[PDB]
């Protein structure tokens, strides 16, 4: 019976043929993903999955995503959870997923002297979830990967979460940061960039209870700010909430505001997601939604078709959670993209629901 490894490799194959990544690139970030696994790649499917873990409904420790351009493939990136094989205690699980990172960096030449000014706050030893590390690796022509590294702002308690990113924030030279992010109701993740870079570059996610299309136009705080109006017709796209007293109120819609560089004191970057799972009846539907937004944004379908066909043989219609987020991804000086989050679903495929 499969591996977990052979799965998530397989699947990782066939999208890199969706990114048009050469035979070659993508026997590197094959293997980097198996080595991102531990010894949890050759671990049974029939056995429960190593970890409880946060990263995806049914706890596989791999998410994969796809950023549309207009004119070209999409942008592929693999999101792991490289502590997975630790199981469900979190210093450990945070431990070895900072080994395998350290491992990464070393083979490709990135400092992490960023990453260690920041253990301490992240990695306290009694952590509380609801994860401690995740690695994503933007999955680039020449098989040497954007590394990205996400971290828990409630590791030394959600009361603590705002205090935690304002601290990593002060720590990374971004001191005027903070305080320019809008009002939310938490602080799920900050993800740290890996590279080389003079100034550090950080993106901070925000939750935001009970969102409507119109707030989704003004949560921006980048410099220039993105349509309004834009904004408003994705939202009300991928939450099924045309036309005034819709808002997602379930799972709620995440705002991200990436930093890179310290000079402006504003953010580059505003994504917003929407977790299209919970408000549909079936992946069919969530289908729907992200061939509107791709069509609306004028990149091409057929791809995202493919990429679907990548992950999983079922019908749509027979499960809910395929696609788990739409993204509008907005940055300074470059072109919007459209991003579906795609699920592994190595362990389970929750069933579809009657009404949404
Ligand atoms: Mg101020």
């Given at each position: 019976?499969?591996?977990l490894?052979?799965?998530?490799?397989?699947?990782?194959?066939?999208?890199?043929?969706?990114?048009?990544?050469?035979?070659?690139?993508?026997?590197?970030?094959?293997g980097?993903?198996?080595?991102?696994?531990?010894?949890?790649?050759?671990?049974?499917?029939?056995?429960?999955?190593?970890?409880?873990?946060?990263?995806?409904?049914?706890?596989?420790?791999?998410?994969?995503?796809?950023?549309?351009?207009?004119?070209?493939?999409?942008?592929?990136?693999?999101?792991?959870?490289?502590?997975?094989?630790?199981?469900?205690?979190?210093?450990?699980?945070?431990?070895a997923?900072?080994?395998?990172?350290?491992?990464?960096?070393?083979?490709?030449?990135?400092?992490?002297?960023?990453?260690?000014?920041?253990?301490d706050?992240f990695?306290?030893?009694?952590?509380?979830?609801?994860?401690?590390?995740?690695?994503?690796?933007?999955?680039?022509?020449?098989?040497?990967?954007?590394?990205?590294?996400?971290?828990?702002?409630?590791?030394?308690?959600?009361?603590?979460?705002?205090?935690?990113?304002?601290?990593?924030?002060a720590?990374?030279?971004?001191?005027?940061?903070?305080?320019?992010?809008?009002?939310?109701?938490?602080?799920?993740?900050?993800?740290?960039?890996?590279?080389?870079?003079?100034?550090?570059?950080?993106?901070?996610?925000?939750?935001?209870?009970?969102?409507?299309?119109?707030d989704?136009?003004?949560?921006?705080?980048?410099?220039?700010?993105?349509?309004?109006?834009?904004?408003?017709?994705?939202?009300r796209?991928?939450?099924?909430?045309?036309?005034?007293?819709?808002?997602?109120?379930?799972?709620?819609?995440?705002?991200?505001?990436?930093?890179?560089?310290?000079?402006?004191?504003?953010?580059?970057?505003?994504?917003?997601?929407?977790?299209?799972?919970?408000?549909?009846?079936?992946?069919?539907?969530?289908?729907?939604?992200?061939?509107?937004?791709?069509?609306?944004?004028?990149?091409?379908?057929?791809?995202?078709?493919?990429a679907?066909?990548?992950?999983?043989?079922?019908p749509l219609?027979?499960?809910?959670?395929?696609?788990?987020?739409?993204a509008?991804?907005?940055?300074?000086?470059?072109?919007?993209?459209?991003?579906?989050?795609?699920?592994?679903?190595?362990?389970?495929?929750?069933?579809?629901?009657?009404?949404?």
């Open positions: 019976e499969a591996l490894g052979d799965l998530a490799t397989g699947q990782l194959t066939r999208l890199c043929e969706v990114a048009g990544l050469t035979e070659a690139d993508t026997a590197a970030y094959t980097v993903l198996i080595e991102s696994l531990g010894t949890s790649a050759g671990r049974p499917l029939s056995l429960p999955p190593p970890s409880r873990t946060f990263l995806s409904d049914d706890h596989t420790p791999v998410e994969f995503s796809l950023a549309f351009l207009p004119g070209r493939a999409p942008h592929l990136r693999v999101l792991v959870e490289p502590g997975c094989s630790s199981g469900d205690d979190l210093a450990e699980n945070g431990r997923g900072l080994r395998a990172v350290h491992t990464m960096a070393d083979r490709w030449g990135f400092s992490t002297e960023q990453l260690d000014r920041l253990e706050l990695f306290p030893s009694s952590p509380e979830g609801p994860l401690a590390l995740w690695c994503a690796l933007e999955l680039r022509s020449g098989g040497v990967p954007g590394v990205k590294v996400y971290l828990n702002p409630a590791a030394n308690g959600a009361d603590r979460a705002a205090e935690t990113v304002r601290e990593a924030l720590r990374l030279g971004h001191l005027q940061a903070f305080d320019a992010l809008p009002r939310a109701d938490g602080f799920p993740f900050l993800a740290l960039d890996l590279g080389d870079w003079d100034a550090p570059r950080v993106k901070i996610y925000l939750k935001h209870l009970g969102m409507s299309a119109a989704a136009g003004s949560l921006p705080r980048m410099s220039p700010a993105p349509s309004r109006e834009q904004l408003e017709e994705f939202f796209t991928a939450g099924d909430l045309p036309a005034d007293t819709g808002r997602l109120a379930g799972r709620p819609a995440l705002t991200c505001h990436s930093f890179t560089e310290t000079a402006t004191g504003r953010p580059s970057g505003y994504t917003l997601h929407v977790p299209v799972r919970d408000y549909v009846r079936h992946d069919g539907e969530a289908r729907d939604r992200a061939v509107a937004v791709l069509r609306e944004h004028d990149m091409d379908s057929a791809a995202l078709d493919r679907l066909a990548a992950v999983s043989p079922r219609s027979d499960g809910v959670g395929l696609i788990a987020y739409l509008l991804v907005h940055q300074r000086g470059r072109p919007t993209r459209v991003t579906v989050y795609v699920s592994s679903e190595a362990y389970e495929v929750r069933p579809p629901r009657e009404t949404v």
